Design an enzyme around this catalytic site. Structure first.
Site, short mmCIF file in Angstrom:
data_model
loop_
_atom_site.label_atom_id
_atom_site.label_comp_id
_atom_site.label_asym_id
_atom_site.label_seq_id
_atom_site.Cartn_x
_atom_site.Cartn_y
_atom_site.Cartn_z
CB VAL A 39 -34.25 86.08 59.25
CG1 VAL A 39 -35.12 87.21 59.92
CG2 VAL A 39 -33.13 85.44 59.78
N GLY A 40 -34.50 82.47 58.60
CA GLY A 40 -34.12 81.57 57.82
C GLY A 40 -33.75 80.10 58.38
NE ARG A 41 -37.04 77.22 54.99
CZ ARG A 41 -36.64 76.99 53.52
NH1 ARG A 41 -35.39 77.40 53.25
NH2 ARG A 41 -37.37 76.36 52.79
N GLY A 42 -32.14 76.08 56.70
CA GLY A 42 -31.57 75.37 55.92
C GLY A 42 -31.31 73.88 56.48
CE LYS A 43 -28.43 69.44 52.93
NZ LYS A 43 -28.16 68.60 54.17
CB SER A 45 -27.99 76.15 60.59
OG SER A 45 -27.99 77.09 59.43
CD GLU A 46 -34.85 76.09 63.05
OE1 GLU A 46 -34.62 75.76 64.40
OE2 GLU A 46 -36.05 75.79 62.84
CB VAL A 47 -30.54 82.04 60.13
CG1 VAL A 47 -29.91 83.48 60.08
CG2 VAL A 47 -29.41 81.09 59.64
CG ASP A 150 -23.12 75.87 49.62
OD1 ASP A 150 -23.80 75.58 48.41
OD2 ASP A 150 -24.03 75.85 50.57
#
Length: 327
Positions: A39-43, A45-47, A150
């Protein structure tokens, strides 16, 4: 510079509260949790949405990209310290892949709606309500001696259906100690406060209030993001073209900061632009005098002049939301 409120939280509490480097992680069972979909991703982590095999209840799985052990210990300890606070995401478990030793943090499930489609549909009142709920989370963490660092739409999960809000991604959060110098490479560009853009390292909880202000401005003006800078230098220029250069120079001399010549030249000279000049046919239904008054008390150069989260919650802009809450 010191914080005007909650300055002594970590000074009064036991070293075990804030010494995150000495934490000892009680790892759970990796098998209890199964990934269902991304359902998501960033610099960092992956979610994923996951399932707790035993109760068959939904949960959220955050798989951490490789980082130093300290940063991992920091996020966990902060989550443990805040567990149970209003609108703070709840850490349920911590597990690691035996082989890789890749950590995953397991959180309560939240059924989030993508802010890019949610925001343009919120009605004036909705904005009031969600901004109030986010303030509860911020007052709680500040009161517990922590800065989030953040705050941005992406880190505020909302389930518009249920009217539920959660502040997530505590990966950049730190404990506030009076007079400590922090890294200024925090927050996300569009939500960075001036302190960070001018290398004022002894910042505090008021940083999160600048970011909240940026978010707020974005919602009531439907101008996302509100301050659209390309790089860090341009970000400062974008702020200055709105708040004006006179207040900036008052700020810099008060804290004795010298802007780098190149930057100084980029900034230039600019008159303050009244908040009303951003009013237009698409936002008009969102822009009351009370909205502007509140925004104005948030977006100040001097971090010391910004409203604290506690004060913010008592601003008249929120009074219907408060009344509703008092049943």
């Amino acid at each position: 510079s010191k914080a005007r409120v909650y300055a002594d939280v970590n000074v009064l509490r036991p070293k075990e509260y804030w010494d995150y480097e000495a934490l000892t992680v009680q790892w759970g069972e990796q098998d209890d949790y199964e990934v269902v979909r991304k359902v998501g991703r960033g610099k960092y982590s992956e979610v994923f949405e996951g399932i707790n095999v035993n109760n068959n209840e939904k949960c959220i799985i955050k798989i951490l990209k490789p980082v130093k052990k300290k940063k991992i210990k920091r996020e966990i300890k902060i989550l443990q310290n805040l567990c149970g606070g209003p609108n703070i995401v709840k850490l349920l478990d911590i597990v690691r892949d035996q082989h890789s030793k890749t950590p995953s943090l397991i959180f309560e499930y939240v059924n989030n709606t993508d802010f890019k489609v949610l925001y343009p549909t919120l009605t004036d009142y909705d904005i009031r309500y969600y901004i109030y709920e986010l303030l509860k989370a911020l007052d709680y963490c500040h009161s517990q001696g922590i800065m989030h660092r953040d705050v941005k739409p992406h880190n505020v999960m909302i389930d518009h259906e249920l009217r539920k809000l959660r502040l997530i991604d505590w990966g950049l959060a730190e404990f506030y100690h009076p007079g400590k110098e922090y890294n200024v490479r925090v927050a996300s560009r569009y939500f960075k406060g001036p302190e960070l853009l001018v290398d004022l390292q002894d910042y505090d909880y008021s940083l999160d209030m600048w970011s909240l202000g940026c978010m707020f401005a974005g919602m009531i003006f439907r101008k996302e993001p509100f301050f659209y800078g390309h790089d860090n230098h341009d970000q400062l220029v974008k702020i200055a073209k709105v708040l004006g250069t006179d207040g900036l120079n008052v700020y810099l001399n008060k804290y004795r900061i010298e802007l780098d010549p190149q930057l100084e030249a980029l900034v230039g000279r600019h008159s303050r632009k009244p908040w009303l000049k951003f009013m237009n046919a698409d936002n008009q239904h969102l822009v009351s005098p009370e909205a502007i008054d509140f925004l104005d008390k948030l977006l100040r150069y001097d971090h010391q002049e910004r409203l604290t989260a506690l004060e913010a919650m008592t601003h008249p802009y929120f009074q219907q939301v408060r009344a509703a809450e008092n049943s």
